[PDB]
Amino acid sequence: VSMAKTSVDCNMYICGDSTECANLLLQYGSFCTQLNRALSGIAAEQDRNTREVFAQVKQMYKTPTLKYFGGFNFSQILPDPLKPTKRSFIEDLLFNKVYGECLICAQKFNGLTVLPPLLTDDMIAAYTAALVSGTATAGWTFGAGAALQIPFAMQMAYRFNGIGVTQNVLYENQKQIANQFNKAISQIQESLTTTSTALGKLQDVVNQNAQALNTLVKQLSSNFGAISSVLNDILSRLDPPEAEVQIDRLITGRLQSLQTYVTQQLIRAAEIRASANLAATKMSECVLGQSKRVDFCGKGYHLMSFPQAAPHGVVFLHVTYV
Amino acid sequence: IANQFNKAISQIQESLTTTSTALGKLQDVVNQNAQALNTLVKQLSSNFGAISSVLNDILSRLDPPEAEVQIDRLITGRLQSLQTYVTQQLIRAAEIRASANLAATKMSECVLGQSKRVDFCGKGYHLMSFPQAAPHGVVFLHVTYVPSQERNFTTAPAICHEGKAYFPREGVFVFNGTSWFITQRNFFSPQIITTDNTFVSGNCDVVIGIINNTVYDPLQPEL
Amino acid sequence: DAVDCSQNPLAELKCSVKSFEIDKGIYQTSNFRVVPSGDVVRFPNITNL
Amino acid sequence: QLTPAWRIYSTGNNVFQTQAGCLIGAEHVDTSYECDIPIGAGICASYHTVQKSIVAYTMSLGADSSIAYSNNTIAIPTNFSISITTEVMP
Numbered sequence: 001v002s003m004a005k006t007s008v009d010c011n012m013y014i015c016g017d018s019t020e021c022a023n024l025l026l027q028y029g030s031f032c033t034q035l036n037r038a039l040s041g042i043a044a045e046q047d048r049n050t051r052e053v054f055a056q057v058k059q060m061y062k063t064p065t066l067k068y069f070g071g072f073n074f075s076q077i078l079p080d081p082l083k084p085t086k087r088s089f090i091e092d093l094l095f096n097k098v099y100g101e102c103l104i105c106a107q108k109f110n111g112l113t114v115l116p117p118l119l120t121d122d123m124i125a126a127y128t129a130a131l132v133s134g135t136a137t138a139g140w141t142f143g144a145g146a147a148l149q150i151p152f153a154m155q156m157a158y159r160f161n162g163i164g165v166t167q168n169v170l171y172e173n174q175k176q177i178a179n180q181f182n183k184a185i186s187q188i189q190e191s192l193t194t195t196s197t198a199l200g201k202l203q204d205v206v207n208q209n210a211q212a213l214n215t216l217v218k219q220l221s222s223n224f225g226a227i228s229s230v231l232n233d234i235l236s237r238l239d240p241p242e243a244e245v246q247i248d249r250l251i252t253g254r255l256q257s258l259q260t261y262v263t264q265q266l267i268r269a270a271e272i273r274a275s276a277n278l279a280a281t282k283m284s285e286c287v288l289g290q291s292k293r294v295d296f297c298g299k300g301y302h303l304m305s306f307p308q309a310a311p312h313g314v315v316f317l318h319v320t321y322v
Numbered sequence: 323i324a325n326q327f328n329k330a331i332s333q334i335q336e337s338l339t340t341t342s343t344a345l346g347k348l349q350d351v352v353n354q355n356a357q358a359l360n361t362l363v364k365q366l367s368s369n370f371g372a373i374s375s376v377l378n379d380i381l382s383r384l385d386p387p388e389a390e391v392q393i394d395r396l397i398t399g400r401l402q403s404l405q406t407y408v409t410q411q412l413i414r415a416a417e418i419r420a421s422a423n424l425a426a427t428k429m430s431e432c433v434l435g436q437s438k439r440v441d442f443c444g445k446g447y448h449l450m451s452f453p454q455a456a457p458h459g460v461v462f463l464h465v466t467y468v469p470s471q472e473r474n475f476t477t478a479p480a481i482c483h484e485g486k487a488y489f490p491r492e493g494v495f496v497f498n499g500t501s502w503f504i505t506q507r508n509f510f511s512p513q514i515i516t517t518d519n520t521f522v523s524g525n526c527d528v529v530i531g532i533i534n535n536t537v538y539d540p541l542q543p544e545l
Numbered sequence: 546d547a548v549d550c551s552q553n554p555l556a557e558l559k560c561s562v563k564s565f566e567i568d569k570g571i572y573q574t575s576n577f578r579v580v581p582s583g584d585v586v587r588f589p590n591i592t593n594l
Numbered sequence: 595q596l597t598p599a600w601r602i603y604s605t606g607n608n609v610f611q612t613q614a615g616c617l618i619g620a621e622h623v624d625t626s627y628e629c630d631i632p633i634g635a636g637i638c639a640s641y642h643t644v645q646k647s648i649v650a651y652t653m654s655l656g657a658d659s660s661i662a663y664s665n666n667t668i669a670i671p672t673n674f675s676i677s678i679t680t681e682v683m684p
């Protein structure tokens with residue numbers, strides 16, 4: 001539900017290390033400015049996408065001492081305050097599977113840099129934790145209004161009846177159901193731990209972003225028919241009058257790559273928005289309520305789901321009746 | 323209900339008379355259009371590496387050979403500017419097109435019917451909605467039911483009567499000041515627990531949290 | 546009226562957005578850089594006379 | 595040694611660097627509020643009393659609330675209200 005908040009210095013990219021060269025860029029007026037504006041716009045959208053998806057609850061909740069409810073074991077989904085890391089075990093596992101910057105700061109010569117998000121991973125974890133913790137006790141009214149305590153067993157019974165199974169069945173088999181639930185969680189943990197395809201979608205987005213940037217920078221070494229891709233070696237060698245032709249040519253060549261880059265970024269952003277919109281919808285209908293539409297919250301008959309924090313995305317655990 | 327409805331409408335009317343953000347989304351689209359148009363036209367004054375940004379200032383002082391070269395440079399520049407514009411225009415169109423599809427969906431589900439899906443027509447429980455005409459867009463007024471102040475009651479999964487386990491129908495077993503009743507989860511109306519508002523299945527030794535209680539059966543006063 | 550676009554950061558923003566009024570928020574108006582000081586020029590050892 | 599620079603400009607004691615960049619002229623508090631004007635990395639800025647000034651703060655994530663769990667009792671509404679929400683799309 002996001003991509004890197006990239007930024008490019010349009011001056012330094014097209015031409016640097018020269019005050020003579022710079023005089024030619026000025027003949028294109030505010031081009032440099034509007035290009036910068038566009039990249040900023042995209043970064044702003046990335047922020048919006050994240051906030052809309054996660055900030056679905058007005059209040060934050062804290063995690064209960066009890067992790068055992070009606071026989072159901074939720075300790076792997078919830079964060080455990082016992083340890084320094086304010087994340088669930090599942091979340092840590094998910095994170096472990098996936099230009100200028102600052103963590104100390106550093107800067108490159110390519111004019112590229114990436115901005116930080118408003119909301120850090122831990123802040124997100126707080127939201128996902130709050131949602132699970134909240135819904136665990138508030139049940140059906142969690143998003144509707146005030147959080148009203150409903151015994152876990154009663155939440156389940158209601159939802160079973162929702163699907164069309166007399167609550168009597170759940171109660172008779174309560175022990176069996178809790179066991180299957182607990183088992184499934186352990187199953188998922190191992191599945192994620194020993195695989196290499198999980199979250200492939202998130203890696204894909206990151207890879208695409210890197211490719212776009214790598215391509216943009218690499219082309220700086222292109223001559224475009226000029227004497228050299230290096231501006232500093234044009235002036236030294238060629239008579240300064242004629243040199244303007246060589247420089248303008250190089251500027252034109254490079255300007256073309258910026259236009260291509262920014263265009264592609266807008267297109268990529270559109271696809272992301274679509275994803276974020278879906279994710280937000282799923283959050284509301286699969287987590288904060290009980291969706292009835294088939295195959296929206298999983299293949300089977302929807303009973304429950306939980307969100308987990310993820311490296312530039314959202315991971316859902318879908319609990320279904322089969 | 324009618325009273326709150328009427329006031330809610332009045333409250334909105336007043337809000338839309340003094341605020342400044344309600345239609346920010348519509349103004350944003352308009353502003354973007356204006357910016358794009360001004361940007362494209364403004365570039366007509368760009369030099370684009372030519373001896374002059376004006377065709378007349380080229381032809382009027384250059385022989386046709388050199389003049390054509392300078393014009394060609396100018397043309398190439400302006401062509402790229404227009405191409406840039408139209409590409410951006412398509413991208414903008416795509417986003418709006420998507421919005422329109424959603425808006426059509428919302429009218430269909432929130433206005434011409436009653437939504438069951440949560441958080442689509444509003445945060446509360448959907449009751450009603452009305453479209454309103456708006457410049458370059460659509461404004462909806464969504465009417466929802468919202469639960470208010472709650473009260474604490476003790477509950478029970480089932481009750482045991484005459485050795486049999488009785489389970490609730492659509493409601494939940496609720497305990498008030500020394501009396502059990504059954505009522506709907508989303509409201510409070512404590513009904514007498516009667517044989518025809520429940521069902522019996524299984525004994526009392528296969529239920530967790532089951533309590534002892536009685537079930538009314540009209541047979542007795544009838545007989 | 547008139548705005549001196551180099552008087553202070555606020556004036557710069559006013560000029561940047563072509564307006565004498567600003568509603569609210571954070572705005573990027575320009576970039577910045579540090580200016581180099583002295584000249585470090587180095588030549589080979591030079592032994593050949 | 596900076597370009598650009600302004601004719602009338604000075605640096606006060608209100609200087610503090612964060613991951614998202616450093617601020618000059620904005621004060622820094624040990625409290626939190628709703629994020630008004632975002633900076634980055636959990637930091638936002640707003641205009642508050644002290645006489646008002648620009649301050650930086652760690653943003654609030656949401657209201658502070660907690661409910662006790664009970665496997666014995668249930669909470670249910672004993673009243674309701676009706677309200678109308680306004681939504682706009684282009």
Ligand SMILES: *[C@@H]1O[C@H](CO)[C@@H](O[C@@H]2O[C@H](CO)[C@@H](O[C@@H]3O[C@H](CO[C@H]4O[C@H](CO)[C@@H](O)[C@H](O)[C@@H]4O)[C@@H](O)[C@H](O[C@H]4O[C@H](CO)[C@@H](O)[C@H](O)[C@@H]4O)[C@@H]3O)[C@H](O)[C@H]2NC(C)=O)[C@H](O)[C@H]1NC(C)=O
Nearest residue numbers: 065066067068069071072073074075076089182183185186
């Ligand atoms: C939800 O379900 C999870 C499990 O799915 C429960 O948490 C588990 O709790 C059990 C305790 O019963 C943990 O047991 C582990 O046993 C390992 C083996 O050593 C013990 O057993 C041998 C058997 O002969 C004895 O000889 C030996 O003396 C020990 O008794 C331990 O090595 C594990 O230790 C872990 O924690 C320590 C903490 O410092 C670490 O240093 C270790 O490296 C290791 O991480 C542990 O004792 C089991 O690991 C738990 N798993 C998890 C994931 O927590 C939850 O409690 C349950 N929740 C609810 C609410 O029911």
Ligand SMILES: *[C@@H]1O[C@H](CO)[C@@H](O[C@@H]2O[C@H](CO)[C@@H](O[C@@H]3O[C@H](CO[C@H]4O[C@H](CO)[C@@H](O)[C@H](O)[C@@H]4O)[C@@H](O)[C@H](O[C@H]4O[C@H](CO)[C@@H](O)[C@H](O)[C@@H]4O)[C@@H]3O)[C@H](O)[C@H]2NC(C)=O)[C@H](O)[C@H]1NC(C)=O
Nearest residue numbers: 149471472473474475660661662663664667668669670671
């Ligand atoms: C549903 O049920 C939950 C609990 O399961 C309710 O939450 C509780 O709400 C009650 C409301 O009073 C809280 O009551 C606590 O009582 C303590 C005892 O003192 C009172 O009673 C004695 C009896 O003789 C009187 O003499 C005395 O004057 C008091 O009347 C208080 O000490 C508690 O105060 C707490 O907050 C103050 C705030 O400054 C602190 O200073 C105190 O030290 C203390 O922390 C409090 O009044 C009870 O604590 C709540 N429990 C929980 C877990 O929240 C729900 O409200 C209820 N919902 C509905 C709709 O009924």
Ligand SMILES: *[C@@H]1O[C@H](CO)[C@@H](O[C@@H]2O[C@H](CO)[C@@H](O[C@@H]3O[C@H](CO[C@H]4O[C@H](CO)[C@@H](O)[C@H](O)[C@@H]4O)[C@@H](O)[C@H](O[C@H]4O[C@H](CO)[C@@H](O)[C@H](O)[C@@H]4O)[C@@H]3O)[C@H](O)[C@H]2NC(C)=O)[C@H](O)[C@H]1NC(C)=O
Nearest residue numbers: 066068069070151477478479530531532663664665666667
């Ligand atoms: C909902 O979830 C809650 C919390 O998980 C459950 O509440 C707990 O219920 C258990 C059931 O008994 C309570 O158990 C406690 O056991 C203590 C130990 O003594 C008993 O066991 C020994 C074993 O050999 C026997 O010899 C002895 O005779 C007892 O049988 C008791 O001391 C505790 O008593 C408490 O209350 C009395 C009241 O006057 C006090 O005098 C005592 O000092 C003490 O406070 C108690 O019986 C456990 O405490 C409960 N927890 C809480 C927080 O109340 C609910 O049961 C669960 N609901 C359902 C339906 O399962």
Ligand SMILES: *[C@@H]1O[C@H](CO)[C@@H](O[C@@H]2O[C@H](CO)[C@@H](O[C@@H]3O[C@H](CO[C@H]4O[C@H](CO)[C@@H](O)[C@H](O)[C@@H]4O)[C@@H](O)[C@H](O[C@H]4O[C@H](CO)[C@@H](O)[C@H](O)[C@@H]4O)[C@@H]3O)[C@H](O)[C@H]2NC(C)=O)[C@H](O)[C@H]1NC(C)=O
Nearest residue numbers: 480481482483484485486526527529530531532533534535
């Ligand atoms: C709703 O109202 C009904 C009717 O009032 C209650 O029914 C009671 O249920 C309890 C269950 O615990 C019955 O208790 C029975 O006691 C018998 C006597 O042994 C006990 O007492 C002697 C006294 O010295 C002790 O020495 C001895 O150790 C015991 O403590 C038991 O024999 C009964 O056991 C039954 O079940 C076992 C299960 O394997 C069988 O093996 C036995 O053969 C036998 O079937 C039982 O424990 C009590 O008698 C019932 N009352 C009546 C009138 O029948 C419900 O409990 C009540 N429900 C609620 C929720 O309150």
Ligand SMILES: *[C@@H]1O[C@H](CO)[C@@H](O[C@@H]2O[C@H](CO)[C@@H](O[C@@H]3O[C@H](CO)[C@@H](O)[C@H](O[C@H]4O[C@H](CO)[C@@H](O)[C@H](O)[C@@H]4O)[C@@H]3O)[C@H](O)[C@H]2NC(C)=O)[C@H](O)[C@H]1NC(C)=O
Nearest residue numbers: 473474475496497498499500501502503504511512513514
């Ligand atoms: C839990 O629910 C039960 C039932 O749902 C509820 O008990 C009810 O309380 C009301 C109190 O308003 C009782 O209403 C009665 O109505 C008759 C008819 O006019 C009155 O005569 C009754 O007055 C009694 O008390 C007077 C006090 O001086 C006496 O003078 C008079 O003779 C009567 O004794 C009273 O208003 C209603 O009948 C009961 N219902 C039952 C079945 O008892 C209970 O209060 C609820 N508890 C909580 C905490 O909500």
Ligand SMILES: *[C@@H]1O[C@H](CO)[C@@H](O[C@@H]2O[C@H](CO)[C@@H](O[C@@H]3O[C@H](CO)[C@@H](O)[C@H](O)[C@@H]3O)[C@H](O)[C@H]2NC(C)=O)[C@H](O)[C@H]1NC(C)=O
Nearest residue numbers: 101102103104105106107609610611612613614615616617
């Ligand atoms: C921005 O630049 C300043 C100036 O260099 C950095 O401040 C310096 O930070 C280090 C580490 O926090 C300070 O301690 C040093 O640690 C090394 C560790 O081996 C030690 O060898 C040094 O003798 C010293 O102890 C150092 O004193 C400090 N300098 C000053 C003037 O305070 C600052 O960290 C940089 N900011 C970022 C984000 O990198």
Ligand SMILES: *[C@@H]1O[C@H](CO)[C@@H](O[C@@H]2O[C@H](CO)[C@@H](O[C@@H]3O[C@H](CO)[C@@H](O)[C@H](O)[C@@H]3O)[C@H](O)[C@H]2NC(C)=O)[C@H](O)[C@H]1NC(C)=O
Nearest residue numbers: 323324325326327329469470471509510671672673674675
């Ligand atoms: C749900 O709560 C609302 C209020 O939060 C209740 O509506 C209010 O009901 C009273 C009648 O009991 C209405 O009239 C009031 O009467 C008192 C009597 O002295 C008077 O002083 C007040 O000025 C007023 O006239 C009150 O207007 C009404 N509120 C509104 C907005 O109309 C409602 O009844 C509760 N619902 C249930 C089921 O309890």
